[PDB]
Amino acid sequence: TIFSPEGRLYQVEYALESISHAGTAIGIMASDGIVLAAERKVTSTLLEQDTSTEKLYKLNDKIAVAVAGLTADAEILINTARIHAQNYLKTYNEDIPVEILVRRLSDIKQGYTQHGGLRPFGVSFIYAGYDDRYGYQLYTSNPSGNYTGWKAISVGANTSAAQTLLQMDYKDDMKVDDAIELALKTLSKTTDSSALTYDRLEFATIRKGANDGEVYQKIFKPQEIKDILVKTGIT
Amino acid sequence: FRNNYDGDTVTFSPTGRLFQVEYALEAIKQGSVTVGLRSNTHAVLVALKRNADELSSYQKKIIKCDEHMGLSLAGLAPDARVLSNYLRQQCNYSSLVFNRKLAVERAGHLLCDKAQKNTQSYGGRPYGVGLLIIGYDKSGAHLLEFQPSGNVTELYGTAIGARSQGAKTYLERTLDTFIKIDGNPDELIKAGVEAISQSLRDESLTVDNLSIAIVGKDTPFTIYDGEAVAKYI
């Protein structure tokens, strides 16, 4: 929470540095939904993937996050984001607008940036959500308290490579299935592993509930990632 | 041995010294001279005031604390305001609660204890002012010397600040004369004024130069400035 002679924030810059070594997460926004995809940090055969969750978190029923950084620091923030969503719903009898939940979390982060002598959270979030004001939304927040909206974005390891590739293949009139495909391809080329297998991935979508007129959150099961990995020509 | 041991008041040097306290003591040396002396019927403060400019005021150095007590300062003046204020309250408490004028000695002990806490706290600082305390109570006239280290001593006479040693030498030799000046206010002030002069490379002490205070048997603490001190030059 001190300034450098240049006017940068030491602990912030170093926290971003910390994040740059974490498993990659990508968010892609479509006309009819949103994809979230994340890669697990150098895993093992004995690590459970069934009862496992480390990068993809449900905030309420209309909003999910992808985590790059310190898992434990993120759980702290996820918990208060969940509580903040419920206060808003209790107060107004309406689900929280995506931007409002995001502004709040970023404000918390900003606090550790300006006062108290405590280290910032070593976490960056990609937010995927839907509300009836703006439709599908994709946001990013980092330890500096800064947030911005995206059509497609990445956090963690190899963001430069990942961002180059997304810029190359993304187009405004994409469907969700193309976005799912783009997500896996972009992770395929930015991995630090041999090849992309199912047990190294977390995957989520926010679609328009197939047939209903309602909004659905799907956190893919191991087998579902394994299956989606076949069609796309990666097996 | 002098290095990383003057950071705060909460740290002893390997010698056993407290440097922040010693440095506070140093602000006294750089302060304008003041003299205290007493007989058996009266006690007197003479303070030479110092100006910033020829256009400026000669900053007031004597503070009344009760009808029977008061003091003169050398060093950080704001610190003399905190401490005399505390002394005013303590004198006041003694009156309201016990209908009792506060003994000069108790005032000494109280000031000592207040300064002491600031030589042991973290993030605080020692006081940077010396104080000469005179009073007339149930045991007669008294002079006290307060040091920011928290050491207070009772004396017949003394001086503090810039070149105090001149006046302190004179008073050491004049001892048996001034102590006998009983029931004769003006001669005790004169003995004080001639004491403060042994410490002046400055000059002829003028009308705005001088500040005098007296307390005694039937004299409430009163401060004389300018006009009223002209007859002592």
């Binding site: - | 008041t9 740290t11 000592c112 050491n151």
Partner: protein, 237 residues
């Protein structure tokens, strides 16, 4: 302060000790039904009012306290000893026993050696008195360490004073009388003044004896003070 050095010692305490060793010399002597206390008061200037800068301090009515080092630190400690005695009396009715009073001071002083935000006390305190079961003498160091003593000395001339005390202990196994310890204390202070004599000094003695003060703390004034000054002036010429 909350810092052990690699040898297991506390360097801030160790430095506080230096401030004590730098101080005026003071003593305590246990006698058969009481305790006597004495101190050396340096006459900085002739302008000091004689007999008017009292150093020895009373706690409750039965405990005497004397110290060497930073005088304000000693005063701070006595104030706390006073609150501590009062609190014991309020609750338990009986006046605070000396062993009990010693641990109260002990624990407080020790607490100022636990935290980096506080400094230790720059005094060694010699204190004691007469309680429900006899006379007690104690000395307390900046570390919070204290023990019972037959005789105690601290300050600049502690070594010569301790030497004198050891001689008294070894040559009076039967015990010393309060009246005698009073004179003896005067001797020892004068003898101890040898190690701090680039300045003239004033002697101050107090005592607490069952037969001489009914077990109350009292200053030695007047004739009895002079008799001791005379006895001491004699055995140095």
């Amino acid at each position: 302060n909350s810092v052990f050095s690699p040898d297991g010692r506390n360097f801030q305490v160790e430095y506080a000790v230096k401030a004590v060793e730098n101080g005026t010399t003071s003593i305590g002597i246990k006698c058969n039904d009481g305790v006597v206390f004495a101190v050396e008061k340096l006459i900085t200037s002739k302008l000091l009012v004689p007999q008017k800068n009292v150093k020895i301090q009373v706690v409750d009515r039965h405990i005497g306290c004397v110290y060497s080092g930073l005088i304000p630190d000693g005063r701070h400690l006595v104030n706390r000893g006073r609150e501590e005695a009062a609190s014991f009396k309020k609750l338990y009715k009986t006046p605070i026993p000396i062993p009990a009073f010693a641990d109260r001071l002990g624990q407080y002083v020790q607490a100022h050696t636990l935290y980096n935000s506080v400094r230790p006390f720059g005094v060694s305190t010699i204190f004691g008195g007469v309680d429900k079961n006899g006379a007690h003498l104690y000395m307390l160091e900046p570390s919070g360490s204290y023990w019972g003593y037959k005789g105690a000395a601290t300050g600049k001339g502690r070594q010569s004073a301790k030497a004198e005390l050891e001689k008294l202990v070894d040559h009076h196994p039967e015990g010393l009388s309060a009246r005698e310890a009073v004179k003896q204390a005067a001797k020892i202070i004068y003898l101890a003044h040898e190690d701090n004599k680039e300045k003239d000094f004033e002697l101050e003695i107090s005592w607490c004896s069952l037969s001489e003060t009914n077990g109350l703390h009292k200053f030695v004034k007047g004739d009895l003070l002079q008799e001791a000054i005379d006895f001491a002036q004699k055995e140095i010429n």
